[PDB]
Amino acid sequence: LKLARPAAGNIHVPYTQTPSGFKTWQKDRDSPLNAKAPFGCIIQTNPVRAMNCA
Amino acid sequence: STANHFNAYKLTRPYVAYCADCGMGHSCHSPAMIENIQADATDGTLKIQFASQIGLTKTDTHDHTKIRYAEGHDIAEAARSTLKVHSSSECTVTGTMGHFILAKCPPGERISVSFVDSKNEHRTCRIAYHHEQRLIGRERFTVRPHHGIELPCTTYQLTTAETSEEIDMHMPPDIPDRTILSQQSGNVKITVNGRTVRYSSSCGSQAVGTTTTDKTINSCTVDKCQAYVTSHTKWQFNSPFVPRRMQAERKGKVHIPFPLINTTCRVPLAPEALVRSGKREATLSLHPIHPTLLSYRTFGAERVFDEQWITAQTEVTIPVPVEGVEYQWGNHKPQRFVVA
Amino acid sequence: STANHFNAYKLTRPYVAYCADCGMGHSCHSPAMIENIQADATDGTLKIQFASQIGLTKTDTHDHTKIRYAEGHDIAEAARSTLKVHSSSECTVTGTMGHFILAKCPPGERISVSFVDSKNEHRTCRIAYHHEQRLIGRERFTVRPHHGIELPCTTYQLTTAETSEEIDMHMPPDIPDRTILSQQSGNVKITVNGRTVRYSSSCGSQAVGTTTTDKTINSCTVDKCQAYVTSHTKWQFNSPFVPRRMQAERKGKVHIPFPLINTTCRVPLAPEALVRSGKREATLSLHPIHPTLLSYRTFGAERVFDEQWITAQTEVTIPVPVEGVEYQWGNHKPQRFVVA
Amino acid sequence: STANHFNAYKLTRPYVAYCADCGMGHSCHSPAMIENIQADATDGTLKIQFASQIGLTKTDTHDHTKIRYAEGHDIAEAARSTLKVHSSSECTVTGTMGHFILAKCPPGERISVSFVDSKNEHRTCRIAYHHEQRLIGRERFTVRPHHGIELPCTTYQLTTAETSEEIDMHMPPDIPDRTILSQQSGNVKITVNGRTVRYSSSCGSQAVGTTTTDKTINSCTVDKCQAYVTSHTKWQFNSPFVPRRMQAERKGKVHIPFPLINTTCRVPLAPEALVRSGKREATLSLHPIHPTLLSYRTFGAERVFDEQWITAQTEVTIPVPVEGVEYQWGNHKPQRFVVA
């Protein structure tokens, strides 16, 4: 977050932030490790357990 | 008032502020300036902060025909049909409780809201908001009507509730205006007005005095005048543009409409695949759909895992390992295969 | 009958449809469930199947003011001009013959129909079927006005008529109707409704009976009676939702209007080129137009033939061999070249 | 005359003209054929020549409701609200003086004007105009309302005023249609009209001469008669489509509305960067914004200087030479320096 000296007369309080890293790390998140797991076990996570772990 | 939400609506004087986007070229006092389009939902429910109080009448009439809007005075009226929300086209409005308007619209880079109900020709703004249709699923189409699949996805709870998470409306502010005063040859005069007017002259006894009534300050000029915005019976919404002319942030909290819940979605399934058998390898003939990210990964040791957004009719060389790889042709079943 | 085609439509009266595409989230009885959106024509006039009558009067009079709608009791009317077809914008309608509506729409992924006669604000369905702009020619632009081309393309000839291929209006739909019967504690009273309702109580005499009027049923309880409505003046659209409640389809005809004819469309011809000749090689400077396919084939024996959908003003070197190439640069005539 | 500019319209009585683009399938003497599209502005506003005088009253008065439509009886009304400019969607109207109608619109390849002001239901024609999104700035975002930037850009200054470029008005035309002649049962009995009914028949009384009365040249057939219409108090725009029925070229000048001038545009500068400089080289992590052309020129002697219209959250390996580089990344100033 970084605020700036805004446009006078109006109350424009410009405050420049970074990109949304949770959104930018969720959307644009990488290959989901549930797929492409070696040994062919289906990693299912109610509790994170690799059911059918071959 | 919560179910009929008009009590908590009428606690806050609904009013508009100077928005920078005003009809392709201006930055003017938007009576329907969008606060912020907040939408955490897989169902694609854009939820903007409504500039007026769309739903609460001039007397806090909780009636769909009345949408509380802005004027010089607090009383601004609009029709319930007079709202337009266009992303790349006018998306259907899903709900509107006072300061919170919510609905689904098509894809686009900017959302534009407009209301002409007392307003001349749809007074509104068009703020940039990249509406992305990035839904879940192996495929990538937006049509519920196929009878193929369901999947769990988020959706804004289309019912109205009393409150789940309230925005604090508080501190009826001042204005930046002086038209409440009028200098008659020495007399700064304040009449009945629609903005609260602290008389604050350039020199004289006009340092105090409310602005809904008459006051005279003789032997002064218009430049020797002084205005101020007094307040009564309201609380400003968030002060996003909002010249913070309240002494301390202390007002009610109006419940945020549309509390989202996890719902289902009609997941479109694709035409599955054609397994052309072979020697240590197979071919997967795929026809296109609304495009689908088909992924086939090896099943065994540290394995080849390919996944491409298939968007045509093509043939994918699925390597047929000794243990066999696990293929998924988009949003179908995850069925792997051994060497047939 | 056929000239006023609404008489032939009124032989098997217009119906409704419980389509799962029901207004961006719903699925219910629309009058405009998109039964079949078929338009195989280079002119781009999609024909959609609408469950009502497009122009058939309630009295079976060819009156363009009325659009045939539906009710529980089948007689539904709407404003025949008030209906709209929004594909990616409001696609321009061409005509309405009974259950067929034919119109040209913009490039888009799906099309929706919206009609509100008693309907609350244009009751609409939205099918997804990617209406692409696949027209033939050297260029790729949709603009008639410059005198540039005349190539034969197929399009639905928009004349009305009696029939070229009739949709079978048959299988008068044996309809359930059980909300119209109410058990007052010993009497299931089934009043007059939109058809003769056969009503089957679980025990006792309630099995059958004309229920286009009232009939009491002894021992009327809420679990007892099940309702159905059997009438006439009806043949099925397709049974697209349509449970086959007729015993066998008795397929009368409805002549699908707007037959296809091979017409000639005006194609755009772009500025042709500049040709710079070198030793056995030629450089065609193409100024760009709306994106156009330039094809240079070396005229003679087994020789290189390249064709590129060029989309920017550049220079392609068509090699001009001793046999000479033939270089058709876009939708102009095939100007060949000899070595010189 | 000019203060109300409709008097400068009223010097040459305007009317719709022959455009072969006349409603997606036909052509005609359209009332609102696009005479020419002129958009030379970095402000992103199109300007078009309209078939009516948008602003002239039915008597050529300054009429905010009045856009003077065309008929055979040329004095045609048009409602000031009925004009719709759908380029790729309903673009924002900006101004209308005479035939000069200017406004903003989205991206697109064509533009359609629709109005039905004497006629019922919206006569609309659509021509081609590849309306690109060619905006200036290091970034690429088309939304004014950020507090980010101000840069010089041309735009059509919308002051209604007299003239900087006066379109011509001369030659009240004749054409290949004069159907005001009649057949009086053995003669060419032509009806009289408001102007010179030039009875150019094959012979008899009909050979020449304007008809202020119903010119009945006896002993004439329909083919033996030929129509003619000569009028006055008018001036053709350019005769662009315009069958040029001017006997001699000489016009008056009507000033093109909205003279362009240099204004300022607001460009949004995105999140600047993360810098990680190492031995002889650095890395600049840019999160994505609206797409921004980041430029890295090697600050020193004749050196490598590259650019990239970056559109992701990626890390450009800023080559940090011993002389240094020049980091020009978007709307920010060229922040470049030597080794860190």
Short mmCIF file of C-alpha atoms in Angstrom, two decimals, chain C residues 206-334:
data_model
loop_
_atom_site.label_atom_id
_atom_site.label_comp_id
_atom_site.label_asym_id
_atom_site.label_seq_id
_atom_site.Cartn_x
_atom_site.Cartn_y
_atom_site.Cartn_z
CA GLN C 206 -61.78 -41.78 -8.76
CA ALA C 207 -60.15 -43.29 -11.80
CA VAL C 208 -61.37 -41.34 -14.86
CA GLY C 209 -63.88 -38.67 -15.74
CA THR C 210 -64.34 -35.45 -17.64
CA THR C 211 -62.71 -32.71 -15.58
CA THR C 212 -63.12 -29.80 -17.94
CA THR C 213 -65.96 -29.25 -15.47
CA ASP C 214 -66.42 -30.05 -11.79
CA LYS C 215 -66.62 -33.50 -10.24
CA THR C 216 -66.56 -34.52 -6.59
CA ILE C 217 -64.76 -37.69 -5.51
CA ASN C 218 -65.75 -39.63 -2.38
CA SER C 219 -63.11 -39.95 0.33
CA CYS C 220 -61.06 -37.03 -0.99
CA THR C 221 -57.69 -36.92 0.73
CA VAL C 222 -54.43 -35.26 -0.28
CA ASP C 223 -52.73 -38.58 -1.04
CA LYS C 224 -55.69 -39.95 -3.00
CA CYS C 225 -56.14 -38.17 -6.33
CA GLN C 226 -53.69 -37.89 -9.21
CA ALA C 227 -54.60 -35.64 -12.12
CA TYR C 228 -54.13 -35.60 -15.87
CA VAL C 229 -55.58 -33.49 -18.69
CA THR C 230 -56.61 -35.01 -22.03
CA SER C 231 -57.79 -32.73 -24.82
CA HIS C 232 -57.57 -32.19 -28.56
CA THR C 233 -56.69 -29.59 -31.19
CA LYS C 234 -53.07 -30.38 -30.48
CA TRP C 235 -50.15 -32.20 -32.01
CA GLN C 236 -46.71 -32.27 -30.41
CA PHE C 237 -43.89 -29.95 -31.37
CA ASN C 238 -41.23 -32.62 -31.06
CA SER C 239 -41.67 -33.92 -27.58
CA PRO C 240 -38.46 -32.00 -26.88
CA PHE C 241 -39.34 -31.97 -23.20
CA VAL C 242 -42.65 -33.46 -24.02
CA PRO C 243 -43.26 -36.84 -22.35
CA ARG C 244 -44.81 -39.01 -25.06
CA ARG C 245 -48.21 -38.99 -23.38
CA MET C 246 -50.00 -39.66 -26.63
CA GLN C 247 -50.29 -43.37 -27.36
CA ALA C 248 -48.93 -42.91 -30.90
CA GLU C 249 -47.94 -39.81 -32.85
CA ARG C 250 -50.54 -38.74 -35.39
CA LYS C 251 -48.24 -36.53 -37.36
CA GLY C 252 -50.02 -33.72 -39.09
CA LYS C 253 -47.87 -31.24 -40.93
CA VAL C 254 -46.72 -27.72 -40.29
CA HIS C 255 -44.80 -26.42 -43.27
CA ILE C 256 -41.49 -25.09 -41.98
CA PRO C 257 -41.46 -21.61 -43.56
CA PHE C 258 -38.49 -19.68 -44.92
CA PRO C 259 -37.10 -22.24 -47.38
CA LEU C 260 -33.50 -21.99 -48.53
CA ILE C 261 -32.43 -20.65 -51.93
CA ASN C 262 -29.02 -20.07 -53.47
CA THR C 263 -28.70 -16.28 -53.80
CA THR C 264 -25.72 -14.06 -54.53
CA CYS C 265 -24.00 -12.04 -51.81
CA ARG C 266 -21.87 -8.97 -52.47
CA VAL C 267 -18.31 -9.75 -51.38
CA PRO C 268 -15.59 -7.19 -50.59
CA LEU C 269 -12.69 -6.90 -53.00
CA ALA C 270 -9.64 -5.26 -51.49
CA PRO C 271 -6.94 -3.11 -53.12
CA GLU C 272 -5.03 -5.61 -55.14
CA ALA C 273 -1.29 -5.22 -54.80
CA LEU C 274 2.02 -3.90 -56.06
CA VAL C 275 4.25 -6.35 -57.96
CA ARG C 276 8.03 -5.90 -57.92
CA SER C 277 9.81 -8.29 -60.24
CA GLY C 278 13.27 -9.69 -59.66
CA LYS C 279 15.38 -12.46 -61.16
CA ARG C 280 12.88 -15.32 -60.97
CA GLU C 281 11.26 -13.90 -57.83
CA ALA C 282 8.40 -11.46 -57.31
CA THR C 283 7.47 -9.37 -54.29
CA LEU C 284 3.77 -8.60 -53.92
CA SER C 285 3.32 -5.65 -51.59
CA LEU C 286 -0.12 -6.22 -50.09
CA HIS C 287 -1.79 -3.36 -48.45
CA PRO C 288 -3.91 -4.75 -45.63
CA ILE C 289 -7.71 -4.91 -45.70
CA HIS C 290 -10.06 -6.84 -43.46
CA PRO C 291 -7.99 -10.07 -43.36
CA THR C 292 -7.62 -11.56 -46.83
CA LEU C 293 -6.14 -14.79 -48.17
CA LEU C 294 -3.50 -14.31 -50.86
CA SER C 295 -2.64 -17.48 -52.77
CA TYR C 296 0.38 -17.82 -55.04
CA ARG C 297 0.77 -21.08 -56.93
CA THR C 298 3.67 -21.78 -59.25
CA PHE C 299 1.92 -22.53 -62.53
CA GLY C 300 3.41 -25.54 -64.28
CA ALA C 301 4.71 -28.89 -63.05
CA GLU C 302 4.77 -30.15 -59.47
CA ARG C 303 5.53 -26.85 -57.83
CA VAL C 304 5.30 -24.87 -54.59
CA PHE C 305 1.85 -23.47 -53.89
CA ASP C 306 1.53 -21.20 -50.88
CA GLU C 307 -1.64 -19.62 -49.55
CA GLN C 308 -1.61 -17.30 -46.55
CA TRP C 309 -4.51 -15.50 -44.91
CA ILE C 310 -2.52 -12.26 -44.81
CA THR C 311 -3.64 -9.70 -42.23
CA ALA C 312 -1.22 -6.76 -42.43
CA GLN C 313 0.27 -4.59 -45.18
CA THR C 314 3.56 -6.31 -45.97
CA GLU C 315 5.41 -7.90 -48.86
CA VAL C 316 5.22 -11.59 -49.74
CA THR C 317 7.78 -12.94 -52.18
CA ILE C 318 5.86 -15.17 -54.57
CA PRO C 319 8.74 -16.80 -56.49
CA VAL C 320 8.15 -16.32 -60.20
CA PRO C 321 9.71 -19.39 -61.84
CA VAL C 322 10.46 -20.00 -65.52
CA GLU C 323 7.05 -21.60 -65.85
CA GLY C 324 5.60 -18.56 -64.08
CA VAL C 325 3.47 -18.50 -60.97
CA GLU C 326 -0.23 -17.77 -60.62
CA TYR C 327 -0.73 -15.38 -57.72
CA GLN C 328 -4.31 -14.71 -56.64
CA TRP C 329 -3.94 -12.10 -53.89
CA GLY C 330 -7.33 -12.09 -52.25
CA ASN C 331 -10.82 -12.17 -53.74
CA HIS C 332 -9.73 -10.49 -56.98
CA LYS C 333 -9.41 -12.48 -60.19
CA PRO C 334 -6.42 -14.87 -60.48
#
